[PDB]
Ligand binder design. Structure first.
Ligand SMILES: Cc1ncc(C[n+]2csc(CCOP(=O)(O)OP(=O)(O)O)c2C)c(N)n1
Ligand SMILES: Cc1ncc(C[n+]2csc(CCOP(=O)(O)OP(=O)(O)O)c2C)c(N)n1
Ligand SMILES: [Mg+2]
Ligand SMILES: [Mg+2]
Lengths: 579, 578
């Protein structure tokens, strides 16, 4: 029946009924299935394909859930779900109401940690190891960490604590030489005679061994697992193993775009997108500005920096999954007269809060942040919704914050930010925007925002994604004015004083948490101006958001067009119900 | 006239004057500097032992290189007193950390000789890489040298940095200042370990370990190392407190020693009962009847008041080094396993773990409790240490609760709740003291309920923790003015806030936090969504880093102290005696 072995496994107990010599076949069955799961659309094919054999060996040897198997990032864990009672739900992975794309504690007893951000497996594994010992229990603790994740400060510091404590712990290093856009770093410790790249951490080191030989992998685990103290099993795997398209092109196949398993041919997006626009703009800027230096923390592809990396190799830098290192390395360059631009997703910028505050903001350094995936990002769910931005940057003295309405306005903010003292942050969503001509570089007074639709009475203030919704909401409402509130640090105070002084009510809309964001900046402003209009604050509630499309999350959170219209109606505006 | 005992320093106004000395005279400068720092520090709360410890390499560094052209970077900066004495600031060591004076750590706008502004650890390597890359980009050849101590190296931000530094392969000298002390004894793996190179796996040259107090022999090395291609780790071994017998004998206390006389080594015993202690006492007592409690600290056992606890409960204490990120996510891991970990951390260093708190602890609403010391303005340490953002950045995290205990009984109350209810909880408290309290004090409180502390609607002041002291004083002989212990920032006391904003002429909020996105901001959001529009005055620390002064000073000029609230009260039309 194409999957004879898998058909009889509903969990790891069913798995432990197969002989070792049956496991390679199960291994093929699992690859078949993972390919079918993903041929759907945007999911993690290659990382999971590469990890099948180790996940099989682990679940064969250890008995979860008494034993705890911890996954770093969790994107490489599809076989794990398939072997733990979730085979049917893979159909809806990352879909609203379905299971999560990563391991989630809520979801299953077998999911040890809720992960999505990288490099948290080892600190968590240590936490469990310590808790175990205090309790007087004993049960295995295995962490699966990829070579890319090993690059993070968090992984590297953790080992050093792990080695000090010297507890019973299995750490499997899943080594691909691939991150997304292929690993960097004086390879973290692998890539070194041949002995122990970790000796200085006082951790036992085994391998490298062949990470696709499931039988050899069982044998090893069985012997490694009752050893005293911490161990690194270093396994070498091929990203996208068992699909020649994925194998040959490990970067595209990390997140393929709907394909036919039989051919290797995929649906090509010809979309534009903020990422590409930022791409074009910096690639163009650095052509005339020798001081511009782009740094990404492991996200060349995700941020539209491929052409940038090819057109200015001498002004590009990939610091690995090390956001802390991105930000303060930019801080260094800025101190030496450069104009560094840190390209970073909103959730990942969270990892560098202190680096922004202490290393950049104190001395008002010249670092421009271009922040991608700002607001809800959708399918990745709680771990990735870049929904805190406008709160946490806002609190930091001297850090400027703007939201471009479009590519032209992005460019302007970029030009400006690159051309004036201090840090500037510019946030934009996952989503598309229109291409503008080469050499489009408008001047804008930073902090000034613009009227877009006439109307006092009720005035909507929003920027970026929220501004679409605002402009859609007001389409046929003559009373209702809209303002492109495109700066959040500086608010446009002259404008807000004037609008808040002579309007019945105001609405603020933000693709950000409601708490301490744009809504709050306005309230604080109005309060210092001793002004008291009716204000309705729409954004994401103070609570995390499961995976869902950005459009439902917004619909349910009350910031999409229909919702703004409902709020407008509560306010007294005549809103049609429409044919 | 020249009646000094420091003939060499008397003639050195910067690195250019120092290179006039022969290399044989260096040991003599080495010793003048030593005496100079002991005299400077006998004042009070300064960084004696670390600075003495690094006297010899700082001398050798300025002798070999030449700032400003070459770039000498210092990690943390608490060890760089010699650097300040050798760079035209010898005379203002008298006022270091004082308002209006030079800063305790390296500071960029303070001297062209200060390559980075520092206060938080582990940031040196990464700025050094940045400077190196820019220099290279610009087509220049000046030296970049960083000084990092061994505790500092414990930090993920240095460890990752080495990883990127080894990858780029650029001219750079990194001196490892290894005295196997942090503030406490340094914590290990890497400390345990130290004809093989410990950094082999990161493509960085390794020289040493070498004697770090031989100034003669450190110049020799530097002269040969500094023109090599690629990055170099120079490993030196020093003695924290070198030069001062009793500092050597006890490098934990002499790290930041009280007023002392150099001749004996006798110091003023600071017999205050601080918050740190009130914490320590409370956790020690609590862990005794609760085996699920586990206290984690990121290198701050002594500062967080955990010395006794680490001795009484060795099996429920953990010191993860200068790595806040690990402190928090180790705690997540613990709580995931039915334990009840307590992360003891200064507000300012909690910033290093914002993402860990959010993603590793908040997403699954985990049983981690944060006792946050140094909440608010810490004073003399200035901008890099004032913990004035925490009410803002925690508030934004779904499910993270925040209390400010009026006092030590209330600390115990909050600690009791957090430890016996689900989800995360953060308790923040100042530098300073409260009255001791009897053993077994464990009040029951309802999390999120404020207490009224003074009668009178009309103007109501809302303050918690340290602001509360000011609020209460301000209000003294003013019968219209009521004070609420707003002992909870998240959640707020919804009902009592609606009651008070519904009835009072005006409200004042006060907070030892930035004014942006904090308690005030939270109050304003609540009133908004309750559709209540009273006059509110929001008092706090302005959206502006605060240079070194005394808390009293910073609070004076920010307008959160008593006379300042009294002024606000007059402005709202309260009758306030002149
Ligand atoms: C803190 C953080 N920054 C960036 C990312 C983006 N990211 C998601 S998966 C991935 C690659 C992880 O590399 P590796 O551990 O080698 O995974 P593998 O391709 O080997 O399966 C990255 C960089 C992330 N998940 N977390
Ligand atoms: C993020 C952070 N956490 C904690 C501190 C507190 N701290 C200041 S100095 C120091 C010890 C520094 O150790 P090391 O580099 O070995 O310097 P040494 O005392 O040996 O001179 C610590 C932990 C800090 N500066 N930054
Ligand atoms: Mg990999
Ligand atoms: Mg040291």
């Amino acid at each position: 029946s194409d999957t004879p072995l898998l058909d009889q496994i509903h969990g790891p107990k069913d798995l432990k009924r197969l002989s070792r010599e049956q496991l390679p076949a199960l291994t093929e069955e699992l690859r078949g299935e993972i390919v079918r799961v993903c041929s759907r659309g945007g999911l993690h094919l290659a990382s999971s394909l590469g990890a099948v054999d180790i996940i099989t060996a682990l679940h064969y040897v250890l008995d979860s859930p008494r034993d705890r198997i911890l996954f770093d990032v969790g994107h490489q864990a599809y076989a794990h779900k398939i072997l733990t009672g979730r085979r049917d739900q893979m159909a809806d992975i990352k879909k609203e109401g379905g299971i999560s794309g990563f391991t989630k504690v809520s979801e299953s007893e077998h999911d040890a940690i809720t992960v999505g951000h990288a490099s948290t497996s080892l600190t968590n594994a240590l936490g469990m190891a310590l808790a175990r010992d205090a309790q007087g229990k004993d049960f295995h603790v295995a962490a699966v960490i990829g070579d890319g994740s090993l690059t993070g400060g968090m992984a590297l510091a953790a080992l050093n604590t792990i080695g000090d404590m010297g507890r019973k712990m299995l750490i499997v290093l899943n080594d691909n030489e691939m991150s997304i856009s292929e690993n960097v770093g004086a390879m973290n410790k692998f890539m070194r005679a041949s002995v122990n790249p970790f000796a200085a951490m006082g951790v036992r080191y085994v391998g490298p061994v062949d990470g696709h030989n499931v039988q050899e992998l069982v044998w090893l685990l069985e012997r490694l697992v009752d050893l005293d103290g911490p161990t690194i099993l270093h396994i070498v795997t091929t990203k996208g193993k068992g699909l020649s398209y994925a194998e040959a092109d490990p970067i595209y196949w990390h997140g393929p775009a709907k394909f036919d398993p039989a051919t290797g041919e995929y649906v090509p997006s010809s979309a534009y997108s903020w990422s590409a626009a930022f791409g074009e703009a910096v690639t163009e800027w650095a052509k005339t500005d020798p001081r511009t230096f782009v740094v990404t923390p492991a996200m060349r592809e995700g941020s539209g920096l491929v052409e940038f990396s090819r057109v200015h190799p001498h002004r590009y830098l990939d610091v690995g999954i090390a956001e802390e290192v991105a930000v303060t390395t930019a801080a260094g360059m800025a101190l030496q007269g450069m104009r560094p631009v840190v390209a970073i997703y909103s959730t990942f910028l969270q990892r560098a809060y202190d680096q922004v505050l202490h290393d950049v903001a104190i001395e008002h350094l010249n670092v421009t942040f271009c922040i991608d995936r700002a607001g809800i990002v959708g399918a990745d769910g709680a771990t990735h919704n870049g929904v805190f931005d406008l709160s946490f940057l806002r609190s930091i003295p001297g850090v400027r914050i703007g939201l471009p309405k479009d590519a032209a306005e992005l460019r302007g903010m970029l030009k400006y930010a690159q051309t004036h003292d201090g840090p500037f942050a510019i946030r934009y969503p996952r989503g598309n925007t229109a291409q503008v001509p080469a050499g489009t570089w408008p001047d804008l007074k930073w902090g000034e925002w613009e009227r877009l639709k006439g109307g006092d009475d009720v005035v909507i203030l929003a920027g970026g994604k929220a501004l679409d919704y605002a402009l859609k909401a007001a389409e046929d409402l003559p009373g209702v004015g809209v303002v492109n509130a495109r700066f959040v640090k500086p608010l446009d105070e002259e404008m807000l004083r004037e609008v808040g002084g002579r309007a019945r009510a105001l609405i603020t809309v933000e693709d950000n948490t409601v708490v301490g964001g744009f809504g709050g900046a306005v309230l604080e402003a109005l309060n210092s101006m001793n002004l008291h209009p009716t204000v309705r604050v729409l954004g994401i509630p103070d609570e995390f958001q499961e995976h869902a499309t950005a459009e439902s999350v917004h619909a349910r959170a009350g910031i999409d067009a229909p919702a703004i219209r409902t709020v407008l109606a509560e306010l007294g505006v005549d809103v049609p119900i429409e044919v």
